Amino acid sequence: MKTITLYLDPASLPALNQLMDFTQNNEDKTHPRIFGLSRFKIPDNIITQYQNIHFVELKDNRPTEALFTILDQYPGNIELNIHLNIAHSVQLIRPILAYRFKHLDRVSIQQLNLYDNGSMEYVDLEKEENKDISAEIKQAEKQLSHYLLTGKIKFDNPTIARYVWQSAFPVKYHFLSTDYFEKAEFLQPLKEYLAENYQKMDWTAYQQLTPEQQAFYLTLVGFNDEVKQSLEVQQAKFIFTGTTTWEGNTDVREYYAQQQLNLLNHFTQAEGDLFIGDHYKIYFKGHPRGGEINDYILNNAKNITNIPANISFEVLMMTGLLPDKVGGVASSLYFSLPKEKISHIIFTSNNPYVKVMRRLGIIDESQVIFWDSLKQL
Ligand SMILES: Nc1ccn([C@@H]2O[C@H](COP(=O)(O)O)[C@@H](O)[C@H]2O)c(=O)n1
């Protein structure tokens, strides 16, 4: 019998966690691996060192039918070690479960490892504040059973359904915020139900790698020597962090780009509401999917040092290269940032994201700043 490891994520944070998993397990050159990480391209000089290494496109938050061609190459008993984005877990596993239906005698699910998309899960859970969570859990388990038995998806509570995987498989959840599950009292039945099936995302993992693995990991995440040297300058630093919109609406993307540029000006200009001081070196950490929103900043700002957008902010924490101050639009990156490094967090326009951050003490009780409430400088 054979284990096949699948690394699946259309987003950013779960993929970053999974690249660490790959690094920790990188000595085994023959272990079958299937990478479905949309935002990441494993360098060819790494692929070359591995056999039984496979790549699958994601479409509509699920591996395409090309997954089946890969799995067909392993005609014996196979156990699937699946790494998943939590918010998209139901769709991402969908084709794996379809394949299993057709190959009942040889395909099993060994275990799930699940990682937060990021703030998304917490914003979603916040919207469930007024529900009987204990009862939502039981209904979600029942409906998960219907899914596993019929292949059909129908959840009364899609959000709670994300957390009932243990009723079917050995699972481990990796949470951006374990504090949220403790502090949100309405969620106490969920914390109790999840028992010993969860842990916090471990940001000390990198410090524990061998020098060789640390180098390997940095290559995976794109943290090159040029970027490292730019952050090793001996001057106090501010990193302005970008956001993106999922709206494939051009007018919305253009509005975001404009508001974000104006927000940067509020941090960096002396007359800005959020003025940080003249002594800072200014950096830009665009959102991985900002695209033309990122370009807008670089084309329209000055005296700013770009940090390549696909480099996850959290890599700076691992490498001990965090700046003095960080500011920009509310982001998953702010959940693991030391409090002393927050300049200001700004929201796009009872806001559940605001509520999430307030519950966690990431922001205080003062009036939140939305970016449409900032004067155009
Ligand atoms: N400016 C940004 C925004 C996001 N990100 C990465 O993408 C993830 C999800 O962030 P968002 O919640 O902003 O979509 C983060 O945890 C961070 O790794 C980044 O590296 N730089």
* CATH number of 285's domain: 3.40.50.11110
Do the Cβ atoms of 79 and 110 come closer than 8 Å? yes
122 in the same domain as 188: yes
Query: 231: closest CA among 286, 282, 275?
Result: 282
Ligand 1 site, residue 289, Cβ cutoff 6 A: no
Give the H/E segment covering residue 215. Answer: helix 211-221
Out of 306, 322, 333, mutate this one to test ligand 1's pocket (max ligand atoms within 8 Å of CB): namely: 333
Q: Exposed, middle or buried by CB within 10 Å (0-12, 13-18, 19+), for 225?
A: exposed
Ligand 1 site, residue 242, Cβ cutoff 6 A: yes
- The residues, any chain, with a CB within 8 Å of residue 124's CB and separated by 6 or more, are 87, 159
Give the three-state DSSP class for 259: helix
Query: For 189, what's the count of Cα atoms within 13 Å in the CB-facing half-sphere?
Result: 14
Query: 326: closest CA among 353, 305, 345, 304?
Result: 345
- Angle CA 298–303–306, to nearest 5: 45
Q: Which atom of ligand 1 is nearest to the CA of 117?
A: 9
Last residue of a domain, one of 185, 209, 233: 209
178 in the same domain as 107: yes
160 in the same domain as 19: yes
Ligand 1 site, residue 287, Cβ cutoff 6 A: yes
Give the three-state DSSP class for 194: helix
335 in the same domain as 251: yes
146 is in an annotated binding site: no
Q: Would you state the structure tokens that stand for residue 224, as one six-digit string?
A: 């090159």
34 Cα to the center of ligand 1, angstroms: 24
Ligand 1 site, residue 177, Cβ cutoff 6 A: no
Experimental method: X-ray
10 in the same domain as 142: yes
Do the Cβ atoms of 260 and 294 come closer than 8 Å? no
230 is in an annotated binding site: no
249 in the same domain as 173: no
User: What does each C-alpha distance from 132 to 137, 164, 190, 226 come to in angstroms?
Assistant: 9, 15, 10, 52
Q: Strands (DSSP E) along 192-336, which ranges?
A: 198-200, 237-241, 281-285, 304-307, 325-329
Query: For 44, what's the count of Cα atoms within 13 Å in the CB-facing half-sphere?
Result: 0
| DSSP string covering 99-143 | HHHHTTTTEEEEEEEEE--SHHHHHHHHTTTTS-HHHHHHHHHHH
Sheet containing strand 369-370, edge to edge, reads 304-307, 281-285, 237-241, 325-329, 342-347, 369-370
Question: How many structural domains comprise the chain?
Answer: 2
Q: Which atom of ligand 1 is nearest to the CA of 16?
A: 18
What is the DSSP code (8-state) at residue 280? P
193 in the same domain as 153: yes
286 in the same domain as 203: no
Q: Which residues on neighbouring strands pair with residue 304, listed in sequence order? A: 282
337 Cα to the center of ligand 1, angstroms: 12
**CB-based burial, 231-249: b 16+ in 10 Å, e otherwise:** beeeeebbbbbbbbbeeee
64 Cα to the center of ligand 1, angstroms: 25
272 is in an annotated binding site: no
168 Cα to the center of ligand 1, angstroms: 31
324 in the same domain as 224: yes
Out of 317, 331, 346, mutate this one to test ligand 1's pocket (max ligand atoms within 8 Å of CB): namely: 331
| DSSP string covering 43-107 | -HHHHTT-SSEEE--BSSSSB-THHHHHHHT--S-EEEEEEEESTTHHHHHHHHHHHHHHTTTTE
Ligand 1 site, residue 117, Cβ cutoff 6 A: no
Give the three-state DSSP class for 308: coil
User: Cα(36)–Cα(211) distance, rounded to whole angstroms?
Assistant: 27
288 in the same domain as 157: no
Do the Cβ atoms of 282 and 305 come closer than 8 Å? yes
Query: For 158, what's the count of Cα atoms within 13 Å in the CB-facing half-sphere?
Result: 9
**CB-based burial, 61-70: b 16+ in 10 Å, e otherwise:** bbbeeebbeb
211-219 long-range contacts (CB < 8 A, ≥24 apart) are 213/23, 213/24, 213/26, 216/23, 216/26, 216/46, 217/19, 217/20, 217/23, 218/315, 218/319, 219/43, 219/46
Structural domain for 159, as ranges: 1-209
Out of 332, 343, 345, mutate this one to test ligand 1's pocket (max ligand atoms within 8 Å of CB): namely: 332
User: Cα(55)–Cα(33) distance, rounded to whole angstroms?
Assistant: 8
Q: Exposed, middle or buried by CB within 10 Å (0-12, 13-18, 19+), for 352?
A: middle
Which residue's alpha carbon is at the smallest distance from atom 18 of ligand 1?
312
117 Cα to the center of ligand 1, angstroms: 10
Place of tokens 């200014």: 282
What resolution in angstrom units was achieved for this structure? 2.2
Ligand 1 site, residue 343, Cβ cutoff 6 A: no
